[PDB]
Amino acid sequence: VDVDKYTRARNAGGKRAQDCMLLAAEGDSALSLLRTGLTLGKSNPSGPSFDFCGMISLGGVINEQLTNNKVLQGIVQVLGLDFNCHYKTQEERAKLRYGCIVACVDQDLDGCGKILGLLLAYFHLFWPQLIIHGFVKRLLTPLIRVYEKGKTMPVEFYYEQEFDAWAKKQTSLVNHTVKYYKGLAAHDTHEVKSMFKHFDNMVYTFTLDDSAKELFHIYFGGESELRKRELCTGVVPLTETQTQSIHSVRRIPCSLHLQVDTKAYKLDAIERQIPNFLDGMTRARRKILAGGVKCFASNNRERKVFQFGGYVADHMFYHHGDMSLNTSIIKAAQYYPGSSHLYPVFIGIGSFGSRHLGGKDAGSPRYISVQLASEFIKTMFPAEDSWLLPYVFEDGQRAEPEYYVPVLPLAIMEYGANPSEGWKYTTWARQLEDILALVRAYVDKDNPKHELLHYAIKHKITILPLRPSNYNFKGHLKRFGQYYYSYGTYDISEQRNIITITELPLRVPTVAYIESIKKSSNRMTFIEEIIDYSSSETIEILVKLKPNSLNRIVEEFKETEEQDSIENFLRLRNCLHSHLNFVKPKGGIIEFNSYYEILYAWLPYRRELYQKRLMREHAVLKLRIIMETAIVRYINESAELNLSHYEDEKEASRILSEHGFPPLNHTLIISPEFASIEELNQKALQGCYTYILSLQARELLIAAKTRRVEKIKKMQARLDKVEQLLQESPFPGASVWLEEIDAVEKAIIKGRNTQWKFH
Amino acid sequence: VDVDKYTRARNAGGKRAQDCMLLAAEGDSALSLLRTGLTLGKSNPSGPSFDFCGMISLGGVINEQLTNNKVLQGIVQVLGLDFNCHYKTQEERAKLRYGCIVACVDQDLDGCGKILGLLLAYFHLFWPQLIIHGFVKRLLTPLIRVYEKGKTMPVEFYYEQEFDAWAKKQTSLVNHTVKYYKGLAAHDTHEVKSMFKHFDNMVYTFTLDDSAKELFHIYFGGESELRKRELCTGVVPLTETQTQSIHSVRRIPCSLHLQVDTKAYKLDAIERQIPNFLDGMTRARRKILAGGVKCFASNNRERKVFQFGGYVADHMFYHHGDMSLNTSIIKAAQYYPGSSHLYPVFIGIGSFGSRHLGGKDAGSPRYISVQLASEFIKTMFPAEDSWLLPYVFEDGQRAEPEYYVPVLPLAIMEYGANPSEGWKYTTWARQLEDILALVRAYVDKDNPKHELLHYAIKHKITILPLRPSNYNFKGHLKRFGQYYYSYGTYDISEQRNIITITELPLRVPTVAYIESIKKSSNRMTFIEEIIDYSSSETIEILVKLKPNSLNRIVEEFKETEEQDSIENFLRLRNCLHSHLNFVKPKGGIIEFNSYYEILYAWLPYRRELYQKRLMREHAVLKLRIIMETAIVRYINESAELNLSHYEDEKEASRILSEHGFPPLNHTLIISPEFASIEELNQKALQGCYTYILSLQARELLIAAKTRRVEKIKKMQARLDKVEQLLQESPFPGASVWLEEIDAVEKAIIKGRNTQWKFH
């Protein structure tokens, strides 16, 4: 009759059992917070205590197998729950040892949504009436606290959207400190006391409606086509009306929790394994790329992998562990035949691995240095449109972007595979020449197939070919039926009775291949020994045969038309199966039938980004021209017309306000940031004033005025060119796209002439 | 007849077997380097190839158990080695399948010294003649390469001392790039080709001498008192004569390798578990403290544990993994009764753990923030003498200091224990009042026991008491015999038949204690249930007894005089066993019989540091006074006496060289660094000149000259005070030490009034 990590309430199971509540803590950290709150003593006389309140741990807890869960068995035992009986009446519910169960879990993705979702699913499966009658409850701790200097009482928000609405109408949010509490352990000692002072206010009840029954069957108890539609749309956050309705009665519908908290957890797991089709990288790889750009921007100096990994964790908010971070960093710099990256983000300094072990023979991160490939990165990922991309915010801090939009589709140009046994994803890189022809035809108006390609977009004609890349592959790519096959190369020495394997299939490691041949009993009866004399980045495997075994091979493998007998005796061919699964930029899962669809879907995103880049540049140039013209006009209208003897902020302001000097916002026009065109327009015009008078005396000289006037002419010439670019026949920024394609191609050619070293 | 990760040489085992060599690679990364070098083809016609050369892996390999090693069995099989036969003659050695075995291991501590030391020990144990006749060899790759711009040929050094001698006489080492190769994976593609172009030059042979036989028995095959003396002295690096003798004949004595490479590996493992008695922290904790000071120096802003852990890895060269780093960071900020740190380095924001689980209930590093305790750290670890401490250099980059010398001995003031099952180390914190009395008496000349204490230092009288700290412990500390015991507190309710435990022993977790009582069958027969209603940082455990079991207890535990029957029925007492094992600052292991010896040994180090601080400050002040006097004298001897129309570096130099302006070194006098007094004297006087003429015109004004003159008087007054401090009766800087002791005490009192929050 014992349960681990369970503290019995004093009144539990007695006459006052219905007044007792069971706190289901997520883990040990949650238990410590509950123990502190439940034992405040005389400091919180009205707060909960160990009277009418108990604790139990939900550690682990991760259908016949469902009943074997030891953690869930303890919850049933302590609550007095009985199977085969439905708690449809109050008198039957009075037999339970506790009045209700309250789940105290973190408000993160690996919190409510997974631990709480399973608890709701477990109760719904066996005792639906308990959820209907409010037996299952949730402790809704504050998510965001805003602290202002001079005030000891913060402003607490239970949802992200609540803070966004409040911050929008809070004018300048400079004197306020914003803290995010995604886990129960994030609360300070004084914050815990405040939460338990109003403990009853943060207890929320779960309600079961008609829509929740279908949702429970989809998310839980089902791993089939039913879940596909739910995960193909993304997470829709709760609206303001829904949030206010929840707080009005402190009742949370089960459907709303599943649609938001549970779905987001499901999508997060997939996003860690499935890349986005816009750039073909997962969120973990984005932080490495975004961190790599930031780390090596000031100086492109060699850094150790573990040293660079610390930079990514410190700056890009990477908290999944250095073991996965260092491995991903190493994979981002590996360059060998059959490597995942045909165009590595980083430059590999040292032994980063080899094709023989499939990159598993990489050196230790302590001795292995890394360096950013500046030439390739600065062209494939332009820095001028990086401000335009949406950015992931981690606890209110800017992190790696939501997605990258490279000049060429990287989801097609690289080899991709997910080691995890779930949501299969395999991508075979298409050759650069085919991809360049398609993109150039789409953008260049003078291309002979420019009109034909645009016609083929709406009808999926696919006039131009897309073929697997044969770079760093001295084999054969043959298309039989609807699948491509990569064939290895072998040499036969009749006099020496030795078969030499000079090439393996496209992505077959040497060590794994030898094991597959060696473990085949039927094939090994013709082989006495296998010797691997292969060099780095080349295959040379000597297969020694029995004295009279070469002849016997041809009558046992039948000499298939598609596969040679030696190519059948030795597994020298493989099928290039593609599982084109990707995550949409807005959220969800998208399925692509062909590599053309991925390229066709990526084109609009890059097309509008060029228009967005020019439109924002046009807005910035107009603001800069106005500011510089006013500064130049100020020199011509200097102390000779209005002196600066006033030397006061208000007093200098009105004297020229009649003249007509605009109160433009400095530090924003000179240095734009991640600000949209609409956001820039309001802040620039309706901002501060102090951009004049703050200049030194030498700027008023005739020589100093000349450079400012010349600067205006330079910006005016640029402004006229931007207008011409916005009016191009195919779409705005078509010529800019073509120029950047050539720059990317030159960087790739330069990186291919060397071993992706560039120096 | 198969061996994993073994590539057979073409001539191995044949007529040319003696010309073949077996390369024993440390791991997969080493194998990749060997494969690249051995297959350079026509690019290296004279280099080694797969002819007369093979590879084998030493992965794992970590006496009856020695013979069961699968990895070593493969080496014996491929070499044709036979037991029970001694290779004392050439004809017997001709039966081996390879001429020699060459170990290709990293030049780091977890390289040669451990993997190579075991290989040498294995051969020495069974076939000593093979080492005598040169069968065992080592591949000595370059350790340090120095690259200078404009030259493609670097300068290679095989030892750290070789580079130090070369860099000492290389004048300004500004145009040279220094790279460290502590592992085989650190070599670039072009460096590997260079190494294998001269492969025979980097092959070194091991020689066995008389002294090596005893050393092999000590380091290997022995875990007893014999190893104690070897590890009590530290590592002595090879001298210049020894290094030159090794390179002259390419023969490495086995004794030299064991005394340097193997001993350093042994000491490194101990240093990761045993702290230094000067500050009571290991090398891992030093990087956290040194990183914490650097991270929070600019702004003391809250940072996540994983975010701060990335900073330590990136800046303090921490490469042992974030799992150990995050755990150590959390332990550095835990503050609860029975915690390891009575004076945590950091301020714990969030749930950092509790006494019930012994700190194991800490929150996830993602949700847990950390903040430096600036008030305590800036006083206990002064920043002005941090430049004086020796510093660990990782690959030529400055890292955390070799040791810290705090104002008070932290090795005595904190609780310490090593979880690892080796080199037992347990420290029980002495109370602050006893420690303050001892240190103050030693430093203050006016203390009544100042003369008595100094007399007691040389005779170990120990006039002043040292007692275990009772802070955050509502129990009893009783000294019986030669050991201290901490007793818990209990309450007995006769009418309720419940025993309430209001206090546990000093360092006994609540959860572990209940398990110990619950697992005792004899004790559990009187207990029906145990309920843990304890609050945070307080103990309240209800023990429910059988109706007639309280009486029976007293006749079964006999009511020992030292231990009460209830204190015996419930394990409410423990022995404060102390294992005072520490690592010496210079290296080695030191054993302390009593806590007085640790305090007595720490005193000289802190005493000389104060003298070193004042002596360097005196030297800096003299240089600053000379520079400022020259600048002031320059204003009085301005263009009126010598103009600056010359405007050339050489031309302006000689015109005032007759006047007598010294060519002082700027950017060093103004901003001292980790430079010794002797180093500072040479560089300051014999440096550059450009400290005059580089000042702006306003500095020559009469008002500007006045502040410079006033600044000289301020420095002159400080210089006179420093001379007075250096002539104090007990020792230089005695009053400075007393002032800093009060500052540390005030910070501790302030941190104890709060819950180590300070705000």
From TrEMBL, chains A, B:
Annotated membrane-spanning segments are none
Protein's cellular compartments? Host cytoplasm
Recall the GO molecular function terms of this protein's record: ATP binding; DNA binding; DNA topoisomerase type II (double strand cut, ATP-hydrolyzing) activity; metal ion binding
The entry's keywords: ATP-binding, DNA-binding, Host cytoplasm, Isomerase, Magnesium, Metal-binding, Nucleotide-binding, Topoisomerase
From the UniProt record, list the reaction(s) this protein catalyses. Answer: ATP-dependent breakage, passage and rejoining of double-stranded DNA
Quote the cellular component terms of the Gene Ontology held in the record: host cell cytoplasm
Q: Which residues form the active site?
A: 367 (o-(5'-phospho-dna)-tyrosine intermediate)
For the protein in the UniProt heading, the enzyme class is isomerase
EC number per UniProt: 5.6.2.2
List residues of the Topo IIA-type catalytic domain.
274-741
* Required cofactor(s): Mn(2+); Mg(2+); Ca(2+)
Q: What does this protein do?
A: Type II topoisomerase. Processively relaxes supercoiled DNA. Displays DNA-supercoiling activity only when associated with the viral histone-like protein.
Report the protein name in the record.
DNA topoisomerase 2
The residues of the intact protein that this chain contains are 413 to 1192 of 1192
